[PDB]
Amino acid sequence: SMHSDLTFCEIILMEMESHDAAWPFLEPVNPRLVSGYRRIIKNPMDFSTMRHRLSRGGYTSSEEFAADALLVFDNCQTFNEDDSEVGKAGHIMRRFFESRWEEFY
Ligand SMILES: CC(=O)c1c(C)[nH]c(-c2csc(N3CCNCC3)n2)c1CCC(F)(F)F
Ligand SMILES: CC(=O)c1c(C)[nH]c(-c2csc(N3CCNCC3)n2)c1CCC(F)(F)F
Known part of the structure; x- marks a missing residue:
C-alpha cells in the first residue's frame, strides 16, 4: 500500500477532488x-483512478503521481476546446495542481 512518504500527494489529490473545477475529472470519462x-x-x-492507484501502492514516487495528474489535464486539452466548460475546468485544475506542487518542488 501507499508509503507514508507520499501522504502529501494523497492530500493534494483530496484537495483537487474537492475543488469547484474538479467535477469533469472525478471519474473516468464516461461513454454513456x-x-x-x-x-x-x-x-x-x-482522479478516482489516481486515488486508488496511490492508496494501493501503484505510485512508487511522487513523480509518477504528478505525471498522472498532468495526464488528466493534457487529455482535457487534447479533447476539449479551450472555451468549453470542461476545457476551462482543466486549465483551472492544472494551475491549482501546479501551485500545490510548487510548495514542495
Ligand atoms: C456544471 C456544468 O457546467 C455541467 C455541464 C456543462 N454539463 C454537465 C453535465 C453533462 S451530463 C451531466 N450529468 C448530470 C448528473 N448525472 C448524469 C448526467 N452533467 C454539468 C453537470 C456537472 C455535474 F454536476 F454533473 F458534475
Ligand atoms: C470529453 C471530456 O473530456 C469530459 C470529461 C473529462 N468529463 C466530462 C463530463 C461531462 S459531464 C460529466 N459528469 C460529471 C460528474 N457527474 C456526472 C457527469 N463529465 C466530459 C464530457 C464533456 C462533454 F462532452 F459532455 F461536454
Whole structure:
C-alpha cells in the first residue's frame, strides 16, 4: 500500500477532488455521456483512478503521481476546446495542481 512518504500527494489529490473545477475529472470519462473519447485519448486518467492507484501502492514516487495528474489535464486539452466548460475546468485544475506542487518542488 501507499508509503507514508507520499501522504502529501494523497492530500493534494483530496484537495483537487474537492475543488469547484474538479467535477469533469472525478471519474473516468464516461461513454454513456461522451462519444469518441478513447478513439482519440489513448491514456485516459481521472482522479478516482489516481486515488486508488496511490492508496494501493501503484505510485512508487511522487513523480509518477504528478505525471498522472498532468495526464488528466493534457487529455482535457487534447479533447476539449479551450472555451468549453470542461476545457476551462482543466486549465483551472492544472494551475491549482501546479501551485500545490510548487510548495514542495
Ligand atoms: C456544471 C456544468 O457546467 C455541467 C455541464 C456543462 N454539463 C454537465 C453535465 C453533462 S451530463 C451531466 N450529468 C448530470 C448528473 N448525472 C448524469 C448526467 N452533467 C454539468 C453537470 C456537472 C455535474 F454536476 F454533473 F458534475
Ligand atoms: C470529453 C471530456 O473530456 C469530459 C470529461 C473529462 N468529463 C466530462 C463530463 C461531462 S459531464 C460529466 N459528469 C460529471 C460528474 N457527474 C456526472 C457527469 N463529465 C466530459 C464530457 C464533456 C462533454 F462532452 F459532455 F461536454
